[PDB]
PDB file of C-alpha atoms in Angstrom:
ATOM      1  CA  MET P   1      12.094  -4.332 -20.428  1.00 14.35           C
ATOM      2  CA  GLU P   2       8.361  -2.705 -21.339  1.00 16.95           C
ATOM      3  CA  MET P   3       6.709  -5.037 -18.095  1.00 16.63           C
ATOM      4  CA  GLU P   4       3.508  -6.070 -19.824  1.00 16.89           C
ATOM      5  CA  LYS P   5       5.621  -7.982 -22.170  1.00 11.51           C
ATOM      6  CA  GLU P   6       7.362  -9.225 -18.775  1.00 13.02           C
ATOM      7  CA  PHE P   7       4.350 -10.406 -17.709  1.00 11.97           C
ATOM      8  CA  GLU P   8       3.767 -12.393 -21.332  1.00 12.71           C
ATOM      9  CA  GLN P   9       7.093 -14.066 -20.469  1.00 10.98           C
ATOM     10  CA  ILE P  10       6.335 -15.226 -16.652  1.00 10.95           C
ATOM     11  CA  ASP P  11       2.784 -15.960 -17.818  1.00 12.20           C
ATOM     12  CA  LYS P  12       3.409 -17.797 -20.528  1.00 10.06           C
ATOM     13  CA  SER P  13       6.258 -19.767 -18.930  1.00  9.68           C
ATOM     14  CA  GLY P  14       4.008 -19.520 -15.664  1.00 10.36           C
ATOM     15  CA  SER P  15       6.940 -19.243 -13.492  1.00 11.83           C
ATOM     16  CA  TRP P  16       4.881 -16.838 -11.163  1.00 11.60           C
ATOM     17  CA  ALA P  17       6.198 -18.759  -8.102  1.00 10.96           C
ATOM     18  CA  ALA P  18       9.541 -18.687  -9.297  1.00 16.15           C
ATOM     19  CA  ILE P  19       9.803 -14.607  -9.679  1.00 14.40           C
ATOM     20  CA  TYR P  20       8.512 -14.428  -6.568  1.00 15.07           C
ATOM     21  CA  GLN P  21      10.602 -16.523  -4.763  1.00 16.37           C
ATOM     22  CA  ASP P  22      13.490 -14.719  -6.065  1.00 15.15           C
ATOM     23  CA  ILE P  23      11.848 -11.778  -3.938  1.00 15.31           C
ATOM     24  CA  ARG P  24      11.774 -13.730  -1.106  1.00 16.45           C
ATOM     25  CA  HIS P  25      15.121 -14.872  -1.184  1.00 14.62           C
ATOM     26  CA  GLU P  26      16.528 -11.487  -1.739  1.00 14.08           C
ATOM     27  CA  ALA P  27      14.465  -9.325   0.281  1.00 16.41           C
ATOM     28  CA  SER P  28      16.329  -7.643   3.163  1.00 18.63           C
ATOM     29  CA  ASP P  29      16.182  -8.643   6.697  1.00 17.11           C
ATOM     30  CA  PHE P  30      16.432  -5.725   9.252  1.00 23.05           C
ATOM     31  CA  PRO P  31      16.812  -7.110  12.930  1.00 19.12           C
ATOM     32  CA  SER P  32      13.080  -6.618  15.323  1.00 18.22           C
ATOM     33  CA  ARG P  33      13.895  -5.843  18.575  1.00 16.49           C
ATOM     34  CA  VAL P  34      12.254  -3.966  19.869  1.00 15.94           C
ATOM     35  CA  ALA P  35       8.253  -6.063  18.239  1.00 15.69           C
ATOM     36  CA  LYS P  36       9.923  -9.396  20.403  1.00 16.18           C
ATOM     37  CA  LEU P  37      10.705  -8.182  23.506  1.00 14.73           C
ATOM     38  CA  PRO P  38       8.019  -9.598  26.435  1.00 13.32           C
ATOM     39  CA  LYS P  39       6.227  -6.496  27.405  1.00 12.35           C
ATOM     40  CA  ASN P  40       4.973  -6.300  24.127  1.00 14.17           C
ATOM     41  CA  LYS P  41       4.108 -10.197  22.762  1.00 11.83           C
ATOM     42  CA  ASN P  42      -0.065  -9.217  23.439  1.00 14.25           C
ATOM     43  CA  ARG P  43       0.871  -5.684  20.520  1.00 14.05           C
ATOM     44  CA  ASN P  44       1.862  -8.552  17.920  1.00 16.62           C
ATOM     45  CA  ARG P  45      -1.335 -10.282  15.468  1.00 15.05           C
ATOM     46  CA  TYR P  46       0.874 -12.688  14.267  1.00 15.19           C
ATOM     47  CA  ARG P  47       4.420 -14.180  15.719  1.00 17.21           C
ATOM     48  CA  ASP P  48       5.969 -14.173  12.409  1.00 15.63           C
ATOM     49  CA  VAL P  49       5.259 -10.772  11.610  1.00 17.65           C
ATOM     50  CA  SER P  50       7.072  -7.849  12.919  1.00 14.40           C
ATOM     51  CA  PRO P  51       8.079  -4.417  12.370  1.00 13.42           C
ATOM     52  CA  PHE P  52      12.052  -3.654  11.924  1.00 12.09           C
ATOM     53  CA  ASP P  53      13.149  -1.585  15.085  1.00  9.20           C
ATOM     54  CA  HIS P  54      14.895   1.438  12.643  1.00  8.61           C
ATOM     55  CA  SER P  55      11.175   1.403  10.619  1.00  4.51           C
ATOM     56  CA  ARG P  56       9.027   1.069  13.208  1.00  2.00           C
ATOM     57  CA  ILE P  57       6.530   4.292  14.195  1.00  2.00           C
ATOM     58  CA  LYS P  58       6.505   4.969  18.169  1.00  2.00           C
ATOM     59  CA  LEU P  59       4.028   6.166  20.333  1.00  2.00           C
ATOM     60  CA  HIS P  60       4.512   9.246  22.371  1.00  2.00           C
ATOM     61  CA  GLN P  61       4.015   7.527  25.115  1.00  2.00           C
ATOM     62  CA  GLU P  62       7.022   7.225  27.284  1.00  2.00           C
ATOM     63  CA  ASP P  63       5.500   3.578  29.087  1.00  2.00           C
ATOM     64  CA  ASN P  64       6.114   1.828  25.738  1.00  2.00           C
ATOM     65  CA  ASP P  65       6.405   3.457  23.136  1.00  2.00           C
ATOM     66  CA  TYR P  66       5.588   0.243  20.636  1.00  2.00           C
ATOM     67  CA  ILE P  67       2.838  -0.414  18.712  1.00  2.00           C
ATOM     68  CA  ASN P  68       3.131  -2.451  15.113  1.00  2.00           C
ATOM     69  CA  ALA P  69       3.246  -0.393  12.427  1.00  2.00           C
ATOM     70  CA  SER P  70       6.474   0.825   9.847  1.00  2.00           C
ATOM     71  CA  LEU P  71       7.223   3.621   7.821  1.00  2.00           C
ATOM     72  CA  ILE P  72       7.513   2.929   4.369  1.00  2.00           C
ATOM     73  CA  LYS P  73       9.396   6.082   2.829  1.00  2.00           C
ATOM     74  CA  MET P  74       9.610   5.925  -1.145  1.00  2.00           C
ATOM     75  CA  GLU P  75      12.019   9.022  -1.836  1.00  2.00           C
ATOM     76  CA  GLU P  76      11.865   9.023  -5.505  1.00  2.00           C
ATOM     77  CA  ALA P  77       7.988   9.000  -5.554  1.00  2.00           C
ATOM     78  CA  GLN P  78       7.860  11.377  -2.041  1.00  2.23           C
ATOM     79  CA  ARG P  79       5.011   8.798  -0.703  1.00  2.00           C
ATOM     80  CA  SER P  80       4.804   7.948   2.587  1.00  2.00           C
ATOM     81  CA  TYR P  81       2.767   5.077   3.435  1.00  2.00           C
ATOM     82  CA  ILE P  82       2.216   3.811   7.500  1.00  2.00           C
ATOM     83  CA  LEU P  83       1.701  -0.200   7.225  1.00  2.00           C
ATOM     84  CA  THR P  84       0.383  -2.169  10.367  1.00  2.00           C
ATOM     85  CA  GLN P  85      -1.736  -5.254  11.460  1.00  2.00           C
ATOM     86  CA  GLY P  86      -5.272  -5.276  11.928  1.00  2.00           C
ATOM     87  CA  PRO P  87      -6.071  -3.399  15.655  1.00  2.00           C
ATOM     88  CA  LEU P  88      -6.067  -6.366  17.957  1.00  2.00           C
ATOM     89  CA  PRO P  89      -8.911  -5.100  21.128  1.00  2.00           C
ATOM     90  CA  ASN P  90      -5.714  -4.230  23.450  1.00  2.14           C
ATOM     91  CA  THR P  91      -4.244  -1.458  21.030  1.00  2.00           C
ATOM     92  CA  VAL P  92      -7.128   0.132  19.525  1.00  2.00           C
ATOM     93  CA  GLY P  93      -6.067   3.105  20.827  1.00  2.00           C
ATOM     94  CA  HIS P  94      -2.926   3.233  20.437  1.00  2.00           C
ATOM     95  CA  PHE P  95      -3.901   2.705  16.583  1.00  3.16           C
ATOM     96  CA  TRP P  96      -5.666   5.506  17.067  1.00  5.36           C
ATOM     97  CA  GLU P  97      -3.284   7.812  18.952  1.00  2.00           C
ATOM     98  CA  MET P  98      -0.597   7.065  15.646  1.00  2.00           C
ATOM     99  CA  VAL P  99      -3.440   7.972  14.047  1.00  2.00           C
ATOM    100  CA  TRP P 100      -3.234  11.344  15.525  1.00  2.00           C
ATOM    101  CA  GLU P 101       0.177  11.411  16.596  1.00  3.40           C
ATOM    102  CA  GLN P 102       1.319  11.275  12.803  1.00  4.24           C
ATOM    103  CA  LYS P 103      -0.961  13.498  11.372  1.00  4.70           C
ATOM    104  CA  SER P 104      -2.939  10.656   8.876  1.00  4.48           C
ATOM    105  CA  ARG P 105      -5.639  12.023   7.078  1.00  2.00           C
ATOM    106  CA  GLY P 106      -6.348   8.723   6.087  1.00  2.00           C
ATOM    107  CA  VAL P 107      -6.752   5.059   7.293  1.00  2.90           C
ATOM    108  CA  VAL P 108      -6.872   2.482   4.324  1.00  4.07           C
ATOM    109  CA  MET P 109      -8.896  -0.954   5.783  1.00  3.35           C
ATOM    110  CA  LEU P 110      -8.176  -3.478   3.287  1.00  4.73           C
ATOM    111  CA  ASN P 111     -10.307  -7.592   5.274  1.00  7.78           C
ATOM    112  CA  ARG P 112     -13.282  -7.946   6.249  1.00  7.10           C
ATOM    113  CA  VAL P 113     -13.007  -8.023  10.230  1.00  7.12           C
ATOM    114  CA  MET P 114     -14.239 -11.684   9.879  1.00 12.78           C
ATOM    115  CA  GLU P 115     -12.679 -13.597   7.203  1.00 10.83           C
ATOM    116  CA  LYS P 116     -12.477 -17.518   6.676  1.00  8.99           C
ATOM    117  CA  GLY P 117     -14.985 -17.770   9.569  1.00  7.34           C
ATOM    118  CA  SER P 118     -12.579 -16.381  12.246  1.00  9.43           C
ATOM    119  CA  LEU P 119     -11.857 -12.716  13.669  1.00  9.78           C
ATOM    120  CA  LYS P 120      -8.664 -11.164  11.902  1.00  8.74           C
ATOM    121  CA  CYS P 121      -9.375  -7.494  13.049  1.00  9.46           C
ATOM    122  CA  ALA P 122     -11.485  -6.079  15.731  1.00  9.16           C
ATOM    123  CA  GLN P 123     -14.195  -3.620  15.096  1.00 10.24           C
ATOM    124  CA  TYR P 124     -12.542  -0.522  15.608  1.00 11.52           C
ATOM    125  CA  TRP P 125     -14.340   2.780  14.857  1.00 12.33           C
ATOM    126  CA  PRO P 126     -17.991   3.072  15.545  1.00 12.63           C
ATOM    127  CA  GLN P 127     -20.415   1.481  14.014  1.00 15.67           C
ATOM    128  CA  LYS P 128     -23.302   4.179  14.706  1.00 13.50           C
ATOM    129  CA  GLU P 129     -23.464   8.047  15.020  1.00 11.19           C
ATOM    130  CA  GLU P 130     -25.148   8.104  18.322  1.00 12.18           C
ATOM    131  CA  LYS P 131     -23.110   5.306  19.653  1.00 13.80           C
ATOM    132  CA  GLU P 132     -19.573   6.826  19.739  1.00 18.09           C
ATOM    133  CA  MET P 133     -15.813   4.824  21.156  1.00 16.52           C
ATOM    134  CA  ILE P 134     -13.733   6.561  23.393  1.00 17.45           C
ATOM    135  CA  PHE P 135     -10.265   4.789  24.315  1.00 17.24           C
ATOM    136  CA  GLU P 136      -9.304   5.833  27.663  1.00 19.53           C
ATOM    137  CA  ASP P 137      -5.752   4.354  28.196  1.00 22.79           C
ATOM    138  CA  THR P 138      -4.900   6.499  25.110  1.00 19.60           C
ATOM    139  CA  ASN P 139      -7.986   9.531  25.810  1.00 15.20           C
ATOM    140  CA  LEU P 140      -9.980   9.834  22.328  1.00 13.97           C
ATOM    141  CA  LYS P 141     -13.613   9.775  20.778  1.00 16.81           C
ATOM    142  CA  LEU P 142     -13.982   8.908  17.614  1.00 14.45           C
ATOM    143  CA  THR P 143     -17.790   9.960  15.821  1.00 18.80           C
ATOM    144  CA  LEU P 144     -18.780   8.662  12.977  1.00 17.66           C
ATOM    145  CA  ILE P 145     -20.338  11.587  11.021  1.00 16.84           C
ATOM    146  CA  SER P 146     -21.092   9.670   7.415  1.00 18.83           C
ATOM    147  CA  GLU P 147     -21.142   6.470   5.560  1.00 17.81           C
ATOM    148  CA  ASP P 148     -21.478   5.726   1.887  1.00 17.02           C
ATOM    149  CA  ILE P 149     -21.508   1.836   0.743  1.00 18.25           C
ATOM    150  CA  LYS P 150     -20.664   1.128  -2.811  1.00 16.97           C
ATOM    151  CA  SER P 151     -21.574  -1.927  -3.258  1.00 16.75           C
ATOM    152  CA  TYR P 152     -17.278  -3.761  -2.666  1.00 18.47           C
ATOM    153  CA  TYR P 153     -15.710  -0.986  -0.761  1.00 17.25           C
ATOM    154  CA  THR P 154     -17.653   2.093   1.424  1.00 15.82           C
ATOM    155  CA  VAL P 155     -15.979   5.112   2.510  1.00 18.76           C
ATOM    156  CA  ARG P 156     -16.767   7.000   6.263  1.00 19.51           C
ATOM    157  CA  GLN P 157     -16.105  10.046   7.959  1.00 20.15           C
ATOM    158  CA  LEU P 158     -15.378   9.877  11.517  1.00 20.83           C
ATOM    159  CA  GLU P 159     -14.021  12.390  14.031  1.00 22.39           C
ATOM    160  CA  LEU P 160     -11.284  11.770  16.068  1.00 21.23           C
ATOM    161  CA  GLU P 161     -11.051  14.288  19.112  1.00 19.89           C
ATOM    162  CA  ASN P 162      -8.539  14.900  21.273  1.00 21.07           C
ATOM    163  CA  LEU P 163      -9.826  14.789  24.749  1.00 20.47           C
ATOM    164  CA  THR P 164      -6.897  16.212  26.427  1.00 21.62           C
ATOM    165  CA  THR P 165      -6.945  19.470  24.113  1.00 22.71           C
ATOM    166  CA  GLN P 166     -10.918  19.197  22.309  1.00 20.04           C
ATOM    167  CA  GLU P 167      -9.158  19.248  19.399  1.00 18.64           C
ATOM    168  CA  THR P 168     -11.068  17.126  16.397  1.00 20.17           C
ATOM    169  CA  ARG P 169      -9.925  16.111  12.654  1.00 17.34           C
ATOM    170  CA  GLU P 170     -11.339  14.885  10.706  1.00 17.23           C
ATOM    171  CA  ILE P 171     -10.400  11.090   9.438  1.00 20.61           C
ATOM    172  CA  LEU P 172     -11.846   9.852   6.121  1.00 20.73           C
ATOM    173  CA  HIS P 173     -11.958   5.633   6.514  1.00 22.15           C
ATOM    174  CA  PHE P 174     -11.539   3.586   2.864  1.00 21.03           C
ATOM    175  CA  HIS P 175     -12.648   0.458   3.166  1.00 22.51           C
ATOM    176  CA  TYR P 176     -12.307  -2.546   0.433  1.00 26.63           C
ATOM    177  CA  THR P 177     -15.052  -5.305   1.408  1.00 27.37           C
ATOM    178  CA  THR P 178     -14.809  -7.315  -2.005  1.00 28.29           C
ATOM    179  CA  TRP P 179     -11.475  -8.793  -1.633  1.00 29.84           C
ATOM    180  CA  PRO P 180     -12.353 -13.064  -1.890  1.00 29.02           C
ATOM    181  CA  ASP P 181     -11.694 -14.594   1.388  1.00 29.84           C
ATOM    182  CA  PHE P 182      -8.872 -16.595  -1.093  1.00 30.59           C
ATOM    183  CA  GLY P 183      -6.331 -15.516  -3.536  1.00 30.97           C
ATOM    184  CA  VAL P 184      -7.071 -12.047  -5.573  1.00 31.40           C
ATOM    185  CA  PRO P 185     -10.117 -10.650  -7.879  1.00 30.73           C
ATOM    186  CA  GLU P 186      -9.839 -11.282 -10.767  1.00 31.18           C
ATOM    187  CA  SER P 187      -9.632  -8.168 -12.736  1.00 31.96           C
ATOM    188  CA  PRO P 188      -7.695  -5.086 -10.793  1.00 32.36           C
ATOM    189  CA  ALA P 189     -10.857  -2.710 -12.463  1.00 29.75           C
ATOM    190  CA  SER P 190     -12.750  -2.404  -9.021  1.00 28.69           C
ATOM    191  CA  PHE P 191      -8.817  -2.825  -7.794  1.00 26.89           C
ATOM    192  CA  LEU P 192      -8.253   1.142  -9.533  1.00 27.28           C
ATOM    193  CA  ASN P 193     -11.024   2.672  -8.887  1.00 27.13           C
ATOM    194  CA  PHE P 194     -10.337   2.660  -5.299  1.00 25.80           C
ATOM    195  CA  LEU P 195      -6.995   3.159  -5.126  1.00 28.88           C
ATOM    196  CA  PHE P 196      -7.964   6.386  -7.335  1.00 32.81           C
ATOM    197  CA  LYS P 197     -10.973   7.548  -4.913  1.00 31.20           C
ATOM    198  CA  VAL P 198      -8.274   7.267  -2.019  1.00 32.88           C
ATOM    199  CA  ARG P 199      -6.006   9.155  -4.181  1.00 35.52           C
ATOM    200  CA  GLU P 200      -9.047  11.558  -5.140  1.00 33.42           C
ATOM    201  CA  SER P 201      -9.638  12.481  -1.730  1.00 32.12           C
ATOM    202  CA  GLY P 202      -5.774  13.554   0.015  1.00 28.99           C
ATOM    203  CA  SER P 203      -4.823  11.477   1.759  1.00 28.07           C
ATOM    204  CA  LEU P 204      -1.724  10.457  -0.012  1.00 30.96           C
ATOM    205  CA  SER P 205      -0.336  13.862  -0.769  1.00 34.67           C
ATOM    206  CA  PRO P 206       2.473  15.697   0.885  1.00 32.70           C
ATOM    207  CA  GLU P 207       0.653  17.828   2.910  1.00 33.32           C
ATOM    208  CA  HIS P 208      -1.037  15.532   4.942  1.00 31.41           C
ATOM    209  CA  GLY P 209       0.542  12.264   7.076  1.00 33.59           C
ATOM    210  CA  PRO P 210       1.250   9.358   6.122  1.00 35.54           C
ATOM    211  CA  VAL P 211      -2.054   7.304   5.219  1.00 35.05           C
ATOM    212  CA  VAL P 212      -1.952   4.035   7.316  1.00 32.70           C
ATOM    213  CA  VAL P 213      -3.355   1.432   5.305  1.00 32.29           C
ATOM    214  CA  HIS P 214      -3.954  -1.890   6.833  1.00 29.82           C
ATOM    215  CA  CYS P 215      -5.586  -5.902   5.827  1.00 31.01           C
ATOM    216  CA  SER P 216      -4.971  -8.779   9.131  1.00 33.66           C
ATOM    217  CA  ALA P 217      -0.978  -8.670   9.192  1.00 32.81           C
ATOM    218  CA  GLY P 218      -0.149  -5.373   7.127  1.00 33.44           C
ATOM    219  CA  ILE P 219       1.704  -7.092   4.162  1.00 32.31           C
ATOM    220  CA  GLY P 220      -0.403  -9.233   1.461  1.00 30.93           C
ATOM    221  CA  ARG P 221      -3.348  -7.055   0.217  1.00 29.72           C
ATOM    222  CA  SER P 222      -1.381  -3.646   2.235  1.00 31.96           C
ATOM    223  CA  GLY P 223       1.729  -4.083   0.209  1.00 30.75           C
ATOM    224  CA  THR P 224      -0.368  -4.423  -2.824  1.00 29.38           C
ATOM    225  CA  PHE P 225      -1.848  -1.268  -2.460  1.00 29.78           C
ATOM    226  CA  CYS P 226       1.181   0.305  -2.230  1.00 26.38           C
ATOM    227  CA  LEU P 227       3.240  -1.049  -4.501  1.00 26.62           C
ATOM    228  CA  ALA P 228      -0.009  -0.607  -7.637  1.00 29.58           C
ATOM    229  CA  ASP P 229      -0.166   3.472  -5.821  1.00 27.41           C
ATOM    230  CA  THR P 230       4.260   3.600  -6.041  1.00 27.14           C
ATOM    231  CA  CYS P 231       4.824   1.985  -9.468  1.00 24.24           C
ATOM    232  CA  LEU P 232       1.851   3.913 -10.882  1.00 23.23           C
ATOM    233  CA  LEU P 233       3.479   7.673  -9.046  1.00 23.26           C
ATOM    234  CA  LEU P 234       6.942   6.636 -11.006  1.00 24.11           C
ATOM    235  CA  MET P 235       5.674   5.837 -14.053  1.00 25.98           C
ATOM    236  CA  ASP P 236       3.969   9.693 -14.027  1.00 26.71           C
ATOM    237  CA  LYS P 237       7.136  11.572 -12.538  1.00 26.59           C
ATOM    238  CA  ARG P 238      10.035   9.476 -14.755  1.00 25.56           C
ATOM    239  CA  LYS P 239      10.890  10.755 -18.699  1.00 25.47           C
ATOM    240  CA  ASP P 240      11.043   6.569 -19.799  1.00 23.24           C
ATOM    241  CA  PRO P 241       7.657   5.052 -18.075  1.00 22.13           C
ATOM    242  CA  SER P 242       8.910   1.934 -18.997  1.00 21.05           C
ATOM    243  CA  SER P 243      11.847   2.654 -16.549  1.00 19.54           C
ATOM    244  CA  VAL P 244       9.767   1.419 -13.912  1.00 17.15           C
ATOM    245  CA  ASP P 245      10.769  -2.292 -12.189  1.00 16.30           C
ATOM    246  CA  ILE P 246       8.061  -3.663 -10.035  1.00 14.89           C
ATOM    247  CA  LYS P 247      10.317  -5.798  -8.659  1.00 15.42           C
ATOM    248  CA  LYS P 248      12.370  -3.716  -7.886  1.00 16.68           C
ATOM    249  CA  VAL P 249       9.841  -0.714  -6.288  1.00 17.11           C
ATOM    250  CA  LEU P 250       8.777  -3.861  -3.737  1.00 19.96           C
ATOM    251  CA  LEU P 251      12.228  -5.413  -3.068  1.00 20.64           C
ATOM    252  CA  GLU P 252      12.660  -1.616  -2.030  1.00 22.83           C
ATOM    253  CA  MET P 253       9.852  -1.118  -0.035  1.00 21.66           C
ATOM    254  CA  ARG P 254      10.528  -4.174   1.677  1.00 25.31           C
ATOM    255  CA  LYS P 255      13.799  -2.604   3.302  1.00 28.27           C
ATOM    256  CA  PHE P 256      10.775  -0.874   5.524  1.00 25.05           C
ATOM    257  CA  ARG P 257       8.714  -3.991   6.099  1.00 25.82           C
ATOM    258  CA  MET P 258       8.969  -7.364   5.545  1.00 25.80           C
ATOM    259  CA  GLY P 259       7.202  -9.814   3.987  1.00 25.20           C
ATOM    260  CA  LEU P 260       5.224  -6.975   1.901  1.00 23.87           C
ATOM    261  CA  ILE P 261       2.940  -9.023  -1.050  1.00 23.98           C
ATOM    262  CA  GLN P 262       2.623 -12.768   0.342  1.00 24.31           C
ATOM    263  CA  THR P 263       1.627 -14.274  -2.634  1.00 24.78           C
ATOM    264  CA  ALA P 264       2.737 -15.324  -6.185  1.00 26.57           C
ATOM    265  CA  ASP P 265      -0.858 -14.021  -7.142  1.00 24.99           C
ATOM    266  CA  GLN P 266      -0.520 -11.080  -4.881  1.00 27.08           C
ATOM    267  CA  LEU P 267       2.472 -10.204  -7.825  1.00 26.69           C
ATOM    268  CA  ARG P 268       1.048 -11.151 -10.513  1.00 22.25           C
ATOM    269  CA  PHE P 269      -1.667  -9.427  -9.647  1.00 22.08           C
ATOM    270  CA  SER P 270      -0.067  -6.441  -8.417  1.00 23.27           C
ATOM    271  CA  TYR P 271       0.998  -6.003 -12.620  1.00 24.07           C
ATOM    272  CA  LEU P 272      -2.232  -6.585 -13.287  1.00 24.53           C
ATOM    273  CA  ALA P 273      -2.847  -3.372 -11.719  1.00 24.09           C
ATOM    274  CA  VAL P 274       0.083  -1.359 -12.325  1.00 24.93           C
ATOM    275  CA  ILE P 275       0.050  -2.087 -16.575  1.00 28.51           C
ATOM    276  CA  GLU P 276      -3.982  -1.738 -16.217  1.00 33.38           C
ATOM    277  CA  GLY P 277      -3.703   1.474 -14.354  1.00 33.61           C
ATOM    278  CA  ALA P 278      -0.739   2.775 -16.421  1.00 33.18           C
ATOM    279  CA  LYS P 279      -3.713   3.474 -19.302  1.00 35.33           C
ATOM    280  CA  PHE P 280      -4.428   6.531 -17.855  1.00 32.84           C
ATOM    281  CA  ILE P 281      -1.675   7.149 -15.904  1.00 32.61           C
ATOM    282  CA  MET P 282      -0.145   7.973 -20.536  1.00 29.47           C
ATOM    283  CA  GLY P 283      -3.091  10.657 -21.792  1.00 29.62           C
ATOM    284  CA  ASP P 284      -6.537   8.078 -21.488  1.00 29.92           C
ATOM    285  CA  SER P 285      -8.750   9.995 -19.226  1.00 30.65           C
ATOM    286  CA  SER P 286     -11.743   7.922 -20.097  1.00 27.64           C
ATOM    287  CA  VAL P 287      -9.965   4.758 -18.489  1.00 28.91           C
ATOM    288  CA  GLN P 288     -10.753   6.478 -14.778  1.00 28.34           C
ATOM    289  CA  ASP P 289     -14.900   6.112 -15.855  1.00 30.74           C
ATOM    290  CA  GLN P 290     -15.365   2.541 -17.386  1.00 33.15           C
ATOM    291  CA  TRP P 291     -13.512   1.647 -14.390  1.00 33.70           C
ATOM    292  CA  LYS P 292     -16.359   2.839 -12.917  1.00 36.32           C
ATOM    293  CA  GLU P 293     -18.510   1.329 -14.766  1.00 36.85           C
ATOM    294  CA  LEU P 294     -16.540  -1.951 -15.244  1.00 36.68           C
ATOM    295  CA  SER P 295     -16.524  -1.920 -10.817  1.00 40.25           C
ATOM    296  CA  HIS P 296     -20.790  -1.568 -11.194  1.00 41.57           C
ATOM    297  CA  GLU P 297     -20.428   0.411  -7.267  1.00 39.75           C
ATOM    298  CA  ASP P 298     -23.850   1.908  -7.492  1.00 36.34           C
TER     299      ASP P 298
END
């Protein structure tokens, strides 16, 4: 069923909440035993958001290999994402260790450090060139190289140094700064513009390790980003783009991390992003320029 008509069908009947609960009901449940070990309680930001054991990212250290992060492997799309929570004060070092070990080229941040008057994430990157960060527990140095601030998202160019081997790598930080505290954005143009900026950077491409995507828990906004990217890539690939079933793609992703897409509004927004993104995928290259204008990124 053409998702655009599915969308109007659901919108007219106001059944977004009902579709969403059906997804919740069907979603996978797999063990998360390592996440619940007592030695790992201070490595989880939220008691109710844990990686499954079968898809968790393991740190390459013998002491404790645990981080709250999952690998989401989309075989048909040929895309890998790492979804993770906003780092904690005590896990910032583990976060950058994961980036290094997985050979990621990009980090996608979909939250602000403070929202709704509370802290959602540690400040885990440097704010000034001359004030670098050193993570003593994992033996990494991180330097801000350049910053590129637009009205609702910022791109940063970071240098990550493994202090043991003195190897360095360029990491791109994509920070979407204008997701509202409540609800979802009214139009997705701003959403799509940012996604296609990440794509253009090479950060999602198979030459590199998986992109790291996070918000505060790593399931809501983060899920909306991965779901829209994968759906658009599948519509690009297949002979019949109309055979992209967003609900089924979401259920596949939820085999790898629980809870992806946290609200019915986020589900609705995901449909709207994919429907609008389709116009470009199907040959209207000019739509990308519009989104940039519509986004008022100056």
